Amino acid sequence: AMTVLSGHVVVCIFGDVSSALIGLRNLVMPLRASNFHYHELKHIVFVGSIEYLKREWETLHNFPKVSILPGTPLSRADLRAVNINLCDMCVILSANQNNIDDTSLQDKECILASLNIKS
Amino acid sequence: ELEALIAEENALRGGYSTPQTLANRDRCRVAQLALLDGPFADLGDGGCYGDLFCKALKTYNMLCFGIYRLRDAHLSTPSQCTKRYVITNPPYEFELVPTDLIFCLMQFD
């Protein structure tokens, strides 16, 4: 909250230890492309479970302007902390999408996070 | 307001009281009182359950609910069964043993 983030990027992740590794390096690479300047380079914060964040942090360490908020993307308090209002783009990703075998769970989280942010 | 604070915080918090905050003691509290002993024990052997709750009204506006009487309290053969069973909305002409617990609501503290 004290970290003022305006026009930035928040990423929501529904990951766990049982979930497969998505791979976010390909996501965060063209954000740090040299066709802009370092002042223009946006800040990224990842919201989700610190277990999945620990599973992916061994890949996710060589990159600037990157934060991590452990918690839950459904948490309205966490969204207010990361200032989703001022955030340029929220990205809702799901990691359990190819282990669950039911539309009831298929994208269920993504739909909930979208509806909470809209509400 | 509490539900909105729940949806925003997911943890109840504490705040500094005010007179409007202290006005949130005004929930007319549930209670279970005894009929054998107390200021209402002056009748315990009647049958005017209507007069019983009207005395409860004119005493403390104590809204009765129903009689939590023992199972064998309606019997003449004395057993040692302390299992009580509830009775909802007793009529005006319902009897009354002194060994009784009552479902009553006194005014908010």
PDB file of C-alpha atoms in Angstrom:
ATOM      1  CA  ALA A   1       0.000   0.000   0.000  1.00  0.00           C
ATOM      2  CA  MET A   2       2.818   2.402   0.848  1.00  0.00           C
ATOM      3  CA  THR A   3       4.515   1.388  -2.404  1.00  0.00           C
ATOM      4  CA  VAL A   4       2.796   3.784  -4.798  1.00  0.00           C
ATOM      5  CA  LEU A   5       2.022   1.838  -7.981  1.00  0.00           C
ATOM      6  CA  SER A   6       0.238   3.809 -10.706  1.00  0.00           C
ATOM      7  CA  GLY A   7      -0.175   2.533 -14.250  1.00  0.00           C
ATOM      8  CA  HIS A   8       1.553  -0.685 -13.219  1.00  0.00           C
ATOM      9  CA  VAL A   9       0.775  -4.344 -13.882  1.00  0.00           C
ATOM     10  CA  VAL A  10      -0.683  -6.861 -11.479  1.00  0.00           C
ATOM     11  CA  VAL A  11      -0.757 -10.585 -12.273  1.00  0.00           C
ATOM     12  CA  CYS A  12      -3.198 -12.941 -10.567  1.00  0.00           C
ATOM     13  CA  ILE A  13      -2.179 -16.596 -10.328  1.00  0.00           C
ATOM     14  CA  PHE A  14      -4.174 -19.581  -9.098  1.00  0.00           C
ATOM     15  CA  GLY A  15      -1.205 -21.834  -8.425  1.00  0.00           C
ATOM     16  CA  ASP A  16      -0.358 -24.494  -5.856  1.00  0.00           C
ATOM     17  CA  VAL A  17       2.106 -27.301  -5.251  1.00  0.00           C
ATOM     18  CA  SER A  18      -0.041 -29.773  -7.186  1.00  0.00           C
ATOM     19  CA  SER A  19      -0.402 -27.407 -10.137  1.00  0.00           C
ATOM     20  CA  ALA A  20       1.921 -27.518 -13.106  1.00  0.00           C
ATOM     21  CA  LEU A  21       4.518 -24.827 -13.677  1.00  0.00           C
ATOM     22  CA  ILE A  22       3.118 -22.241 -16.074  1.00  0.00           C
ATOM     23  CA  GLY A  23       6.353 -20.500 -16.923  1.00  0.00           C
ATOM     24  CA  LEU A  24       6.190 -16.728 -16.554  1.00  0.00           C
ATOM     25  CA  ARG A  25       9.589 -15.833 -17.988  1.00  0.00           C
ATOM     26  CA  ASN A  26       8.085 -15.673 -21.480  1.00  0.00           C
ATOM     27  CA  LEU A  27       5.426 -13.370 -20.037  1.00  0.00           C
ATOM     28  CA  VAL A  28       7.799 -10.990 -18.283  1.00  0.00           C
ATOM     29  CA  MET A  29      10.379 -10.876 -21.095  1.00  0.00           C
ATOM     30  CA  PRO A  30       8.769  -8.388 -23.551  1.00  0.00           C
ATOM     31  CA  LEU A  31       7.802  -6.128 -20.655  1.00  0.00           C
ATOM     32  CA  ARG A  32      11.533  -5.547 -20.145  1.00  0.00           C
ATOM     33  CA  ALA A  33      12.279  -5.134 -23.837  1.00  0.00           C
ATOM     34  CA  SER A  34      14.718  -2.415 -24.830  1.00  0.00           C
ATOM     35  CA  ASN A  35      12.317  -0.714 -27.259  1.00  0.00           C
ATOM     36  CA  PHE A  36      11.399   1.553 -24.320  1.00  0.00           C
ATOM     37  CA  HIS A  37      13.383   3.215 -21.538  1.00  0.00           C
ATOM     38  CA  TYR A  38      13.943   2.144 -17.948  1.00  0.00           C
ATOM     39  CA  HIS A  39      11.700   4.904 -16.626  1.00  0.00           C
ATOM     40  CA  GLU A  40       9.031   3.672 -19.038  1.00  0.00           C
ATOM     41  CA  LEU A  41       9.438   0.054 -17.873  1.00  0.00           C
ATOM     42  CA  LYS A  42       6.368  -0.967 -15.871  1.00  0.00           C
ATOM     43  CA  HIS A  43       6.302  -2.615 -12.466  1.00  0.00           C
ATOM     44  CA  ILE A  44       4.889  -6.115 -12.040  1.00  0.00           C
ATOM     45  CA  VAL A  45       3.451  -7.676  -8.894  1.00  0.00           C
ATOM     46  CA  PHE A  46       2.382 -11.314  -8.613  1.00  0.00           C
ATOM     47  CA  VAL A  47      -0.540 -12.206  -6.352  1.00  0.00           C
ATOM     48  CA  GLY A  48      -1.159 -15.771  -5.283  1.00  0.00           C
ATOM     49  CA  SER A  49       0.123 -18.655  -3.218  1.00  0.00           C
ATOM     50  CA  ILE A  50       3.687 -18.430  -1.957  1.00  0.00           C
ATOM     51  CA  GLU A  51       4.048 -22.178  -2.564  1.00  0.00           C
ATOM     52  CA  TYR A  52       3.617 -21.734  -6.319  1.00  0.00           C
ATOM     53  CA  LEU A  53       5.673 -18.562  -6.101  1.00  0.00           C
ATOM     54  CA  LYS A  54       8.486 -20.538  -4.442  1.00  0.00           C
ATOM     55  CA  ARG A  55       8.181 -23.226  -7.120  1.00  0.00           C
ATOM     56  CA  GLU A  56       8.623 -20.570  -9.798  1.00  0.00           C
ATOM     57  CA  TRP A  57      10.995 -18.128  -8.090  1.00  0.00           C
ATOM     58  CA  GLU A  58      14.007 -20.277  -9.020  1.00  0.00           C
ATOM     59  CA  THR A  59      13.212 -19.146 -12.560  1.00  0.00           C
ATOM     60  CA  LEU A  60      11.887 -15.743 -11.489  1.00  0.00           C
ATOM     61  CA  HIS A  61      14.826 -13.867 -10.053  1.00  0.00           C
ATOM     62  CA  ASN A  62      16.889 -12.149 -12.777  1.00  0.00           C
ATOM     63  CA  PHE A  63      14.303  -9.514 -13.608  1.00  0.00           C
ATOM     64  CA  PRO A  64      13.774  -5.928 -12.379  1.00  0.00           C
ATOM     65  CA  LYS A  65      10.550  -4.162 -11.339  1.00  0.00           C
ATOM     66  CA  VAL A  66       9.095  -7.407 -10.004  1.00  0.00           C
ATOM     67  CA  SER A  67       7.264  -7.849  -6.715  1.00  0.00           C
ATOM     68  CA  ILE A  68       5.497 -10.771  -5.064  1.00  0.00           C
ATOM     69  CA  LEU A  69       2.453 -10.613  -2.834  1.00  0.00           C
ATOM     70  CA  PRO A  70       1.664 -13.959  -1.220  1.00  0.00           C
ATOM     71  CA  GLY A  71      -1.994 -14.418  -0.477  1.00  0.00           C
ATOM     72  CA  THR A  72      -5.031 -14.991  -2.646  1.00  0.00           C
ATOM     73  CA  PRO A  73      -6.111 -13.181  -5.840  1.00  0.00           C
ATOM     74  CA  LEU A  74      -9.700 -13.325  -4.591  1.00  0.00           C
ATOM     75  CA  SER A  75      -8.766 -11.226  -1.563  1.00  0.00           C
ATOM     76  CA  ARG A  76     -10.314  -7.799  -1.976  1.00  0.00           C
ATOM     77  CA  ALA A  77      -7.927  -6.449   0.662  1.00  0.00           C
ATOM     78  CA  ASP A  78      -4.949  -7.713  -1.335  1.00  0.00           C
ATOM     79  CA  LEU A  79      -6.352  -6.144  -4.491  1.00  0.00           C
ATOM     80  CA  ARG A  80      -6.777  -2.842  -2.665  1.00  0.00           C
ATOM     81  CA  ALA A  81      -3.204  -3.192  -1.427  1.00  0.00           C
ATOM     82  CA  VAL A  82      -1.823  -3.642  -4.942  1.00  0.00           C
ATOM     83  CA  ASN A  83      -4.029  -0.758  -6.166  1.00  0.00           C
ATOM     84  CA  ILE A  84      -5.752  -2.726  -9.001  1.00  0.00           C
ATOM     85  CA  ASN A  85      -7.684   0.547  -9.651  1.00  0.00           C
ATOM     86  CA  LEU A  86      -4.492   2.413 -10.729  1.00  0.00           C
ATOM     87  CA  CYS A  87      -3.017  -0.813 -12.232  1.00  0.00           C
ATOM     88  CA  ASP A  88      -2.821  -0.607 -16.073  1.00  0.00           C
ATOM     89  CA  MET A  89      -3.703  -4.308 -16.673  1.00  0.00           C
ATOM     90  CA  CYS A  90      -4.698  -7.155 -14.360  1.00  0.00           C
ATOM     91  CA  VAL A  91      -3.714 -10.525 -15.771  1.00  0.00           C
ATOM     92  CA  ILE A  92      -5.631 -13.470 -14.346  1.00  0.00           C
ATOM     93  CA  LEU A  93      -3.833 -16.737 -14.974  1.00  0.00           C
ATOM     94  CA  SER A  94      -4.745 -20.224 -13.825  1.00  0.00           C
ATOM     95  CA  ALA A  95      -2.309 -23.044 -13.161  1.00  0.00           C
ATOM     96  CA  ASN A  96      -4.704 -25.874 -12.212  1.00  0.00           C
ATOM     97  CA  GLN A  97      -6.454 -25.605 -15.590  1.00  0.00           C
ATOM     98  CA  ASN A  98      -4.978 -28.843 -16.972  1.00  0.00           C
ATOM     99  CA  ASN A  99      -5.341 -31.042 -13.863  1.00  0.00           C
ATOM    100  CA  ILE A 100      -9.054 -30.281 -13.162  1.00  0.00           C
ATOM    101  CA  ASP A 101     -11.509 -32.275 -15.357  1.00  0.00           C
ATOM    102  CA  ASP A 102     -14.825 -30.346 -15.018  1.00  0.00           C
ATOM    103  CA  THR A 103     -16.249 -27.070 -16.462  1.00  0.00           C
ATOM    104  CA  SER A 104     -17.486 -26.330 -12.888  1.00  0.00           C
ATOM    105  CA  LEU A 105     -13.766 -25.929 -11.970  1.00  0.00           C
ATOM    106  CA  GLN A 106     -12.715 -24.977 -15.549  1.00  0.00           C
ATOM    107  CA  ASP A 107     -11.791 -21.241 -15.320  1.00  0.00           C
ATOM    108  CA  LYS A 108     -14.095 -21.031 -12.232  1.00  0.00           C
ATOM    109  CA  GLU A 109     -11.398 -19.056 -10.323  1.00  0.00           C
ATOM    110  CA  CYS A 110     -10.657 -16.722 -13.257  1.00  0.00           C
ATOM    111  CA  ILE A 111     -14.357 -15.930 -13.522  1.00  0.00           C
ATOM    112  CA  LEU A 112     -14.556 -15.208  -9.785  1.00  0.00           C
ATOM    113  CA  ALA A 113     -11.509 -12.946  -9.773  1.00  0.00           C
ATOM    114  CA  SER A 114     -12.854 -11.044 -12.774  1.00  0.00           C
ATOM    115  CA  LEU A 115     -16.247 -10.602 -11.154  1.00  0.00           C
ATOM    116  CA  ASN A 116     -14.747  -9.466  -7.852  1.00  0.00           C
ATOM    117  CA  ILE A 117     -12.570  -6.907  -9.620  1.00  0.00           C
ATOM    118  CA  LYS A 118     -15.568  -5.681 -11.604  1.00  0.00           C
ATOM    119  CA  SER A 119     -17.657  -5.469  -8.434  1.00  0.00           C
TER     120      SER A 119
ATOM    121  CA  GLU B   1     -22.172  -3.096   7.394  1.00  0.00           C
ATOM    122  CA  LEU B   2     -20.645  -6.068   9.208  1.00  0.00           C
ATOM    123  CA  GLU B   3     -21.059  -8.207   6.096  1.00  0.00           C
ATOM    124  CA  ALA B   4     -19.343  -5.555   3.970  1.00  0.00           C
ATOM    125  CA  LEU B   5     -16.504  -5.320   6.488  1.00  0.00           C
ATOM    126  CA  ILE B   6     -16.247  -9.111   6.377  1.00  0.00           C
ATOM    127  CA  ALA B   7     -16.052  -9.093   2.572  1.00  0.00           C
ATOM    128  CA  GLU B   8     -13.363  -6.401   2.714  1.00  0.00           C
ATOM    129  CA  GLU B   9     -11.247  -7.660   5.633  1.00  0.00           C
ATOM    130  CA  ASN B  10     -11.948 -11.392   6.354  1.00  0.00           C
ATOM    131  CA  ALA B  11     -11.073 -10.658  10.000  1.00  0.00           C
ATOM    132  CA  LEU B  12     -13.187  -8.777  12.521  1.00  0.00           C
ATOM    133  CA  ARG B  13     -11.307  -5.892  14.111  1.00  0.00           C
ATOM    134  CA  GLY B  14     -11.637  -3.698  17.161  1.00  0.00           C
ATOM    135  CA  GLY B  15     -12.505  -0.017  17.237  1.00  0.00           C
ATOM    136  CA  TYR B  16     -12.786   2.778  19.754  1.00  0.00           C
ATOM    137  CA  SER B  17     -16.272   2.943  21.186  1.00  0.00           C
ATOM    138  CA  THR B  18     -18.633   5.925  20.963  1.00  0.00           C
ATOM    139  CA  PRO B  19     -22.202   6.383  22.303  1.00  0.00           C
ATOM    140  CA  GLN B  20     -23.521   5.090  18.979  1.00  0.00           C
ATOM    141  CA  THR B  21     -21.144   2.124  19.327  1.00  0.00           C
ATOM    142  CA  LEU B  22     -22.384   1.529  22.878  1.00  0.00           C
ATOM    143  CA  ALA B  23     -25.898   1.647  21.442  1.00  0.00           C
ATOM    144  CA  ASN B  24     -24.907  -1.692  19.868  1.00  0.00           C
ATOM    145  CA  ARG B  25     -25.679  -3.515  23.091  1.00  0.00           C
ATOM    146  CA  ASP B  26     -29.387  -3.321  22.343  1.00  0.00           C
ATOM    147  CA  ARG B  27     -29.994  -6.877  21.159  1.00  0.00           C
ATOM    148  CA  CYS B  28     -32.827  -8.369  23.201  1.00  0.00           C
ATOM    149  CA  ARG B  29     -30.901 -11.303  24.554  1.00  0.00           C
ATOM    150  CA  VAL B  30     -31.830 -14.975  24.542  1.00  0.00           C
ATOM    151  CA  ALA B  31     -31.865 -16.727  27.908  1.00  0.00           C
ATOM    152  CA  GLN B  32     -33.061 -19.832  29.724  1.00  0.00           C
ATOM    153  CA  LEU B  33     -34.351 -19.171  33.225  1.00  0.00           C
ATOM    154  CA  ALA B  34     -35.543 -21.454  35.989  1.00  0.00           C
ATOM    155  CA  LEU B  35     -39.131 -21.522  37.195  1.00  0.00           C
ATOM    156  CA  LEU B  36     -38.556 -23.125  40.607  1.00  0.00           C
ATOM    157  CA  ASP B  37     -36.538 -20.225  42.054  1.00  0.00           C
ATOM    158  CA  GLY B  38     -36.558 -16.534  41.256  1.00  0.00           C
ATOM    159  CA  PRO B  39     -38.785 -13.455  41.127  1.00  0.00           C
ATOM    160  CA  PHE B  40     -41.178 -15.298  38.786  1.00  0.00           C
ATOM    161  CA  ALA B  41     -41.316 -18.431  40.948  1.00  0.00           C
ATOM    162  CA  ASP B  42     -44.243 -16.974  42.925  1.00  0.00           C
ATOM    163  CA  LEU B  43     -46.484 -19.201  40.838  1.00  0.00           C
ATOM    164  CA  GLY B  44     -45.072 -22.553  39.854  1.00  0.00           C
ATOM    165  CA  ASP B  45     -48.134 -24.749  40.142  1.00  0.00           C
ATOM    166  CA  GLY B  46     -50.826 -22.987  38.153  1.00  0.00           C
ATOM    167  CA  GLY B  47     -52.049 -23.641  34.639  1.00  0.00           C
ATOM    168  CA  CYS B  48     -52.496 -20.009  33.716  1.00  0.00           C
ATOM    169  CA  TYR B  49     -49.533 -19.963  31.358  1.00  0.00           C
ATOM    170  CA  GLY B  50     -51.201 -16.932  29.820  1.00  0.00           C
ATOM    171  CA  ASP B  51     -51.119 -15.095  33.147  1.00  0.00           C
ATOM    172  CA  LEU B  52     -47.534 -16.309  33.517  1.00  0.00           C
ATOM    173  CA  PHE B  53     -46.338 -14.597  30.381  1.00  0.00           C
ATOM    174  CA  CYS B  54     -48.522 -11.546  31.055  1.00  0.00           C
ATOM    175  CA  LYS B  55     -46.794 -11.269  34.435  1.00  0.00           C
ATOM    176  CA  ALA B  56     -43.511 -11.625  32.536  1.00  0.00           C
ATOM    177  CA  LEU B  57     -44.589  -8.749  30.275  1.00  0.00           C
ATOM    178  CA  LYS B  58     -45.776  -6.447  33.064  1.00  0.00           C
ATOM    179  CA  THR B  59     -42.626  -7.283  35.057  1.00  0.00           C
ATOM    180  CA  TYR B  60     -39.756  -6.897  32.615  1.00  0.00           C
ATOM    181  CA  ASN B  61     -41.275  -7.261  29.110  1.00  0.00           C
ATOM    182  CA  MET B  62     -39.822 -10.762  29.171  1.00  0.00           C
ATOM    183  CA  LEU B  63     -41.001 -12.512  26.028  1.00  0.00           C
ATOM    184  CA  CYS B  64     -41.548 -16.179  26.754  1.00  0.00           C
ATOM    185  CA  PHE B  65     -41.021 -18.736  24.016  1.00  0.00           C
ATOM    186  CA  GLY B  66     -41.996 -22.109  25.427  1.00  0.00           C
ATOM    187  CA  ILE B  67     -41.654 -24.571  28.260  1.00  0.00           C
ATOM    188  CA  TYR B  68     -38.524 -26.734  28.510  1.00  0.00           C
ATOM    189  CA  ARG B  69     -40.109 -29.371  30.713  1.00  0.00           C
ATOM    190  CA  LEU B  70     -38.674 -32.729  31.727  1.00  0.00           C
ATOM    191  CA  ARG B  71     -39.851 -35.848  29.943  1.00  0.00           C
ATOM    192  CA  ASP B  72     -41.322 -37.572  33.002  1.00  0.00           C
ATOM    193  CA  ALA B  73     -42.461 -34.313  34.595  1.00  0.00           C
ATOM    194  CA  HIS B  74     -45.940 -35.043  33.210  1.00  0.00           C
ATOM    195  CA  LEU B  75     -45.973 -38.363  35.063  1.00  0.00           C
ATOM    196  CA  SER B  76     -47.025 -39.340  38.570  1.00  0.00           C
ATOM    197  CA  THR B  77     -44.460 -42.153  38.840  1.00  0.00           C
ATOM    198  CA  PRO B  78     -41.217 -40.405  39.907  1.00  0.00           C
ATOM    199  CA  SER B  79     -38.258 -41.416  37.740  1.00  0.00           C
ATOM    200  CA  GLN B  80     -34.706 -39.929  37.751  1.00  0.00           C
ATOM    201  CA  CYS B  81     -34.645 -38.741  34.128  1.00  0.00           C
ATOM    202  CA  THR B  82     -33.302 -35.198  33.805  1.00  0.00           C
ATOM    203  CA  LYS B  83     -33.791 -35.164  30.025  1.00  0.00           C
ATOM    204  CA  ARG B  84     -35.977 -32.178  29.251  1.00  0.00           C
ATOM    205  CA  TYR B  85     -37.862 -31.686  26.001  1.00  0.00           C
ATOM    206  CA  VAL B  86     -38.987 -28.444  24.420  1.00  0.00           C
ATOM    207  CA  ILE B  87     -42.559 -27.343  23.784  1.00  0.00           C
ATOM    208  CA  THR B  88     -43.122 -24.450  21.373  1.00  0.00           C
ATOM    209  CA  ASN B  89     -45.922 -21.896  21.998  1.00  0.00           C
ATOM    210  CA  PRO B  90     -47.822 -23.263  24.994  1.00  0.00           C
ATOM    211  CA  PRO B  91     -51.477 -22.167  25.081  1.00  0.00           C
ATOM    212  CA  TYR B  92     -53.141 -20.060  27.784  1.00  0.00           C
ATOM    213  CA  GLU B  93     -54.502 -23.072  29.674  1.00  0.00           C
ATOM    214  CA  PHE B  94     -51.239 -25.021  29.854  1.00  0.00           C
ATOM    215  CA  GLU B  95     -50.140 -26.413  33.207  1.00  0.00           C
ATOM    216  CA  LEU B  96     -46.915 -25.702  35.044  1.00  0.00           C
ATOM    217  CA  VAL B  97     -44.689 -27.799  37.304  1.00  0.00           C
ATOM    218  CA  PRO B  98     -42.207 -25.889  39.512  1.00  0.00           C
ATOM    219  CA  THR B  99     -39.298 -28.024  38.285  1.00  0.00           C
ATOM    220  CA  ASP B 100     -39.106 -26.194  35.003  1.00  0.00           C
ATOM    221  CA  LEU B 101     -36.787 -24.244  32.749  1.00  0.00           C
ATOM    222  CA  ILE B 102     -38.296 -21.564  30.538  1.00  0.00           C
ATOM    223  CA  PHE B 103     -37.241 -20.140  27.167  1.00  0.00           C
ATOM    224  CA  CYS B 104     -37.466 -16.400  27.700  1.00  0.00           C
ATOM    225  CA  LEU B 105     -36.070 -13.197  26.227  1.00  0.00           C
ATOM    226  CA  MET B 106     -35.436 -10.270  28.586  1.00  0.00           C
ATOM    227  CA  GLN B 107     -34.682  -6.761  27.213  1.00  0.00           C
ATOM    228  CA  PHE B 108     -31.167  -5.932  25.867  1.00  0.00           C
ATOM    229  CA  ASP B 109     -28.439  -5.090  28.449  1.00  0.00           C
TER     230      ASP B 109
END
